Ligand binder design. Structure first.
Ligand SMILES: NC(=O)OP(=O)(O)OC[C@H]1O[C@@H](n2cnc3c(N)ncnc32)[C@H](O)[C@@H]1O
Ligand SMILES: [Fe+2]
Length: 566
């Protein structure tokens, strides 16, 4: 079957994306933000991403067996907004506007329960037969947590937790409270490493062997003037934090900056001042989730754990789940957040139609790619001089080994918030100055934010304490003693790291580069950070890459077979 999965809607939505499954294989998958260049894909149908998906696979909407949306939108409208006003045809016109998606007739339209979509994005793509399912996000239509059993190609829900008790919303609110912003929870995770925890309950949570209770909020609380509990939980958490924490909310400041010639947004206080709150929030999240995970594993009799929902992006937490006595194996897809419910919805429907879903297979490279002619057009367009090295991978390795920072835009764009060797900025893993250089000089981002490494899978048994694939940088682990001091820009003082392991099959070019690098500096390991300007999405097109390259003080750009230098 050919099934197009979608997320994103014009009204109060984020993380628009589209994924196309053909006979159980991912033909194409991308996030709207990569095309619009507007981060988070807010308040939009995934128009560009779905257009890309069909173009990639050489299909039109008339070739689809089904279209799937990763929320029960009709139920949300009916229960929260006073009615669902759209026929399937009218809904399709919104999701897939006819001016971009000409169609003779309407494909079958399927709405999939949000947490089922999240669950399908983990289970069906994991390459594992069965396991316990833990979904933790902000909120679906109603619930913020789902515990389920994945087995026999089926997903059976065991229990849920109502939205008012959301761990996702909690974490967003803390992030907003600290001035990092609710839209940047990844930053809160990074800040947390710098703080100390005193009381992980925050005088709000109570923990037990199956999870948590939130005494702060009535679990059945429901906003009568909305379709999720975000505002209600925001009001509760902000009042509580101000009452118990020594610092009041950080505030955003909008002022005209003469040097930039525009009004810029800043924070009133340095968010670093809130590092203890960050640490404490991370600790509460971890403890809550440890209990939920232990509980679903025990109830299902499984030792393989699937995690999805946006809280599953918390690599620090994931690392600590992996080492628990109750967990033998773990799979978290790169698209654990809402961006993955397009894929998840497509999978649930495809499975229902009798297809067998193939494993993701250690790669997230499903977005657009560009031929040498296409890259050349973007280059020629700008009039910059460039080279076509006989051995580009060897040359890039040499640049990295010397301490230079290299833009790397190769093959199909990776999907999800982390660069994985398709759209990356690369630097030395071995350099004790590279971290400060990239934060302060290249990206001009917070000094306290860490970096993480890519390495050959073929060496990771020697480098990391665990011999397993870590394809997505979604899970922390620790290095072995021989590597405790060798890799200062990407390994913390406590030996922890957030790796990508790279197989030759997953990414021949990046694998070959890392191999060359290893010949130069002993270890086929590099620093791998997102290729973007601050606050902007990862670059997608050759023109995107050249633009950001032009803006940042980096040494070179390897784009397709071409090398541009500053
Ligand atoms: N349905 C719905 O609400 O969106 P979704 O499934 O994409 O999950 C979003 C949630 O992920 C949380 N989140 C994102 N990254 C996170 C991180 N690194 N650590 C903790 N929570 C995180 C964040 O706090 C937010 O509440
Ligand atoms: Fe979600």
């Amino acid at each position: 079957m050919r099934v197009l999965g979608l997320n994103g809607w014009p009204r109060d939505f984020n993380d628009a994306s589209a994924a196309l499954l053909v006979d159980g294989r991912i033909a194409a998958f991308a996030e709207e933000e990569r095309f619009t260049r507007k981060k988070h894909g807010y308040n939009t149908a995934p128009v560009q991403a779905a257009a890309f998906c069909l173009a990639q696979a050489g299909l039109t909407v008339d070739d689809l067996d089904a279209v799937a949306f990763g929320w029960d939108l009709p139920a949300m409208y009916r229960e929260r907004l006073g009615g669902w006003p759209h026929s399937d045809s009218e809904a399709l016109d919104i999701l897939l506007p006819r001016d971009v998606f000409p169609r003779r007739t309407d494909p079958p339209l399927h709405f999939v329960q949000h947490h089922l979509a999240h669950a399908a994005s983990a289970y069906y793509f994991s390459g594992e037969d069965r396991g316990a399912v833990l979904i933790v996000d902000g909120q679906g239509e109603e619930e913020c947590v789902t515990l389920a059993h994945a087995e026999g190609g089926k997903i059976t829900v065991l229990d849920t937790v109502p939205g008012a008790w959301s761990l996702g919303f909690f974490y967003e609110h803390v992030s907003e409270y600290t001035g990092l912003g609710g839209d940047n929870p990844g930053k809160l995770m990074g800040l947390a490493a710098h703080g100390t925890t005193v009381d992980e309950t925050l005088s709000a949570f109570a923990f037990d062997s199956d999870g948590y209770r939130l005494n702060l909020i009535d679990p059945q609380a429901r906003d009568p003037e909305d379709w999720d509990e975000y505002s209600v939980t925001e009001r509760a958490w902000f009042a509580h934090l101000e009452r118990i924490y020594r610092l009041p909310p950080n505030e955003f400041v909008r002022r005209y900056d003469p040097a930039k010639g525009r009004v810029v947004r800043d924070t009133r206080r340095d968010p670093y001042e809130y590092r203890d709150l960050a640490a404490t929030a991370q600790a509460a999240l971890e403890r809550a989730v440890f209990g939920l995970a232990d509980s679903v594993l025990a109830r299902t009799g499984e030792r393989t754990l699937f995690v999805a929902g946006g809280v599953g992006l918390n690599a620090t937490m994931n690392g600590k789940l992996l080492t628990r006595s109750t967990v033998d194996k773990m799979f978290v897809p790169p698209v654990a957040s809402d961006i993955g419910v397009s894929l998840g919805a497509a999978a649930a429907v495809a499975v229902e139609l009798g297809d067998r879903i193939a494993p993701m297979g250690d790669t997230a490279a499903w977005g657009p790619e560009f031929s040498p002619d296409q890259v050349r057009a973007a280059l020629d367009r700008t009039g910059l001089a460039y080279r076509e090295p006989a051995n580009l991978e060897r040359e890039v390795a040499a640049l990295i080994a010397s301490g230079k920072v290299v833009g790397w835009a190769q093959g199909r764009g990776e999907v999800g918030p982390r660069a994985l060797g398709q759209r990356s900025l690369l630097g030395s893993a071995h350099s004790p100055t590279m971290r400060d250089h990239i934060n302060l000089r290249v990206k001009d981002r917070e000094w306290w934010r860490p970096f993480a490494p890519s390495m050959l899978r073929s060496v990771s048994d020697q480098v990391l304490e665990v011999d397993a694939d870590f394809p997505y940088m979604i899970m922390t682990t620790k290095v072995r003693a021989a590597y405790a001091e060798r890799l200062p820009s990407v390994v913390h003082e406590d030996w922890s790291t957030r790796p990508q392991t790279v197989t030759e099959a997953s990414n021949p070019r990046y694998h070959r580069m890392l191999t060359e690098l290893g010949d130069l500096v002993g270890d086929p390991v590099c620093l791998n950070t997102s290729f973007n300007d601050r606050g902007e999405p990862i670059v997608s097109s050759p023109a995107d890459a050249l633009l950001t390259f032009s803006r940042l003080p980096i040494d070179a750009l390897a784009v397709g077979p071409y090398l541009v230098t500053k």
